Design a protein around this ligand. Structure first.
Ligand SMILES: CN(C)C(=O)C[C@@]1(C(=O)Nc2cncc3ccccc23)CCOc2ccc(Cl)cc21
Ligand SMILES: CN(C)C(=O)C[C@@]1(C(=O)Nc2cncc3ccccc23)CCOc2ccc(Cl)cc21
Lengths: 306, 305
């Protein structure tokens, strides 16, 4: 029993973290096989940050301009190419610690672990969700660029995020490992703002099921609702609408706890209306939305605590 | 910017996790050098746990009764001994992935990362604090025993916890790596209950400093308090007393933010007597107490491992 925001063990990603230096810029790279992936903005030189022409800046670079360091060993860059907003540095050594991996593009509401790095050295690991506005609420200081988001499912690392920038509100933006940004963001210092963030409703419902599995029940009620009436109330609290796909994915938790999805939806409807009244759910006074239905099933047992 | 509950990178510990099987019981072991450490209750069946004589159960065991598996390789147990509530299995192979390490006993309020494991395989890493009642509010299912708690200092792993059991309230109990339980717990299936938990006051203050570093400052007030008047109020709300050592350890955060420790205490004093009033601090409606002053400095400065 118990419920924690749990990150995947970061060891498989730690053995891939390297330091990439281009001129005065130093950030992190992900060394997989004989390729080092990093944000392409490592090549930007002060006046090439408002409107950088990356194709032109990269053409002017040689392999000898990129300094790649893996621990206390300097890797030899033998090629460089760009794929969207990610720079790929071909090196003369395959990473002997390369895990089984894949590059996956995730959708909002999905969770992943972040291995925060500085100068190619891992400093911390935390769990977060891709917000509906395509930002992540990370914890990153200058030098964290190139830090990666990942999931580990059954021996294989799925790389889903690479950190590129911090927006004016302190939230973070990045790309998948193919260099495509999540959200309407660009790797330019031009005026950028995240859209108004909203609550990942399916994740709140999954977390309420986790609370019931862990013995919490005070928020439960005898009501049920239609999916449409629930969505009408939820959107008034900046909660995202719940689709039939979300109701289906909540099915196993519904079967495990004996609380139908729309029965739980009526409990969430009441929680939004009254507040918590000095009570907590899984030690939290706010509704948690960074646990997917998959995370709750992964973390929780097969038998519900009665 | 941003503030997250952050665990140490778990790689150095992952290379030490092995599966230990004794009879029908399977749990996790920590393979360091040529020794596998695990909870001694792996020698227990079902009746044994009700009233166990571990010295007697262990004497009846032979090295071949212990099945130790590191990945898909079986390790040969060549010796077995007990140190308090931990079983030490001498193996014929030193772990080539043994990091620089030490065994440290932590105090309540101190934080550490937990590498939750099942069948010697790491499944998750999370950060938690040793509660003042010596329990940890972990997330553990059956098979998680032997999962370890650790911190990292420079390139050295300090092992501070090994999971042994779950109490009736769902909170967890375990030992240091020398087998000594944290708290008044015993490794037996008997009526046990954690004492009433209290809030780690120095950690709340550190988290308030982290909020000020991140621009969240609505709770700051003009007031200050004495350490004695603060403690009188804190005791009343089931908050741990704040000592001069805590005030000293909060010194760098005080210097960085320009808010004296006793100035921040008057802020906490008001938050306790009045609540948050519909506001949040670092996105939380409750005061967070699982970040030490060192965790806040480490995160709001980027110390790497
Ligand atoms: C991984 N999880 C938990 C998801 O829900 C992913 C996701 C989803 O709906 N997420 C979204 C939740 N809520 C709000 C959102 C706003 C904008 C954008 C997405 C939002 C992503 C989109 O495609 C599907 C399709 C099918 C299912 Cl079952 C889920 C999803
Ligand atoms: C290093 N270089 C070349 C930069 O320009 C990085 C930078 C950035 O956001 N870095 C940051 C990441 N994450 C956290 C941070 C915290 C504080 C301070 C900075 C942080 C800073 C300037 O604004 C942009 C704009 C667009 C892109 Cl893609 C990157 C950036």
């Amino acid at each position: 029993s118990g419920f924690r925001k749990m990150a995947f063990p970061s060891g498989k990603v730690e053995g891939c973290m390297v330091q990439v230096t281009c001129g005065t810029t130093t950030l992190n790279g992900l060394w997989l096989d004989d390729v080092v992936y990093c944000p392409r903005h490592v090549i930007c030189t002060s006046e090439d940050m408002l409107n950088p022409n990356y194709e032109d800046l990269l053409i002017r670079k040689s392999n000898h301009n990129f300094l790649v360091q893996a621990g206390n060993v300097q890797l030899r860059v033998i090629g460089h190419s760009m794929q969207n907003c990610v720079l790929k540095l071909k090196v003369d050594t395959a990473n002997p610690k390369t895990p089984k991996y894949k590059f996956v593009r995730i959708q909002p509401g999905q969770t992943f672990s972040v291995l925060a790095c500085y100068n190619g050295s891992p400093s911390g690991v935390y769990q977060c969700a891709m917000r509906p506005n395509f930002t992540i609420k990370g914890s990153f200081l200058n030098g964290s660029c190139g830090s990666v988001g990942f999931n580990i499912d059954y021996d294989c690392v799925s790389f889903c995020y690479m950190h590129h920038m911090e927006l004016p509100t302190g939230v973070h933006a990045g790309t998948d490992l193919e260099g495509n940004f999540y959200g309407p963001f660009v790797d330019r210092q031009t005026a950028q703002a995240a859209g108004t963030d909203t609550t990942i409703t399916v994740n709140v419902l999954a977390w309420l099921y986790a609370a019931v599995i862990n013995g919490d029940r005070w928020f439960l009620n005898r009501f049920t609702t239609t999916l449409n009436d629930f969505n009408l109330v939820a959107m008034k609290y900046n909660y995202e609408p719940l689709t039939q796909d979300h109701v289906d994915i909540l099915g196993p938790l519904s079967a495990q706890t004996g609380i139908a999805v729309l029965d739980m939806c009526a409990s969430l409807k009441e929680l939004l209306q009254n507040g918590m009244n000095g009570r907590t759910i899984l030690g939290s006074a706010l509704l948690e939305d960074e646990f997917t239905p998959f995370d709750v099933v992964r973390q929780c047992s097969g038998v519900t605590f009665q």
